[PDB]
Symmetry: C6
Subunit: 30 residues, 6 copies
């Protein structure tokens, strides 16, 4: 359980990277 | 099982990063 | 415990990637 | 075994990110 | 212990990605 | 052991991402 919860924290952080990359794409378009 | 399922959630989030990066490439080309 | 703590260190490093990507977006906009 | 196989799926997804970043580099150069 | 040490190697590699992204930001600004 | 070896494969792939990001920085400079 404790290991699985820490791994889920990694998944959440990776999703934050994906959103930041989408921000870059929008800045390039603009 | 519980840990393996959480690791698979990380793999899915990483694929979302890959798609966001492809969106940057398309914005550069456009 | 020790494995979970190492995984949390990965999560923190991933958040640092997200902030660096945000800096790229601001540089492109500027 | 099952945890190791899930971790290998993460490794493959990370390689797909690397290729997408290479596409950005080619788009910038072009 | 062996698994925790390998996870710490991932954290170090992620920090190397963060620095490479900062180099992109500097190149854009320059 | 088997889990640790799979985690080391992830670290190697993350380093490949860092190198690809450096390629982007060089393309921007050029």
């Amino acid at each position: 359980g404790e290991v699985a919860q820490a791994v889920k924290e990694v998944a959440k952080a990776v999703k934050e990277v994906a959103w930041a990359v989408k921000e870059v794409a929008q800045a390039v378009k603009g």
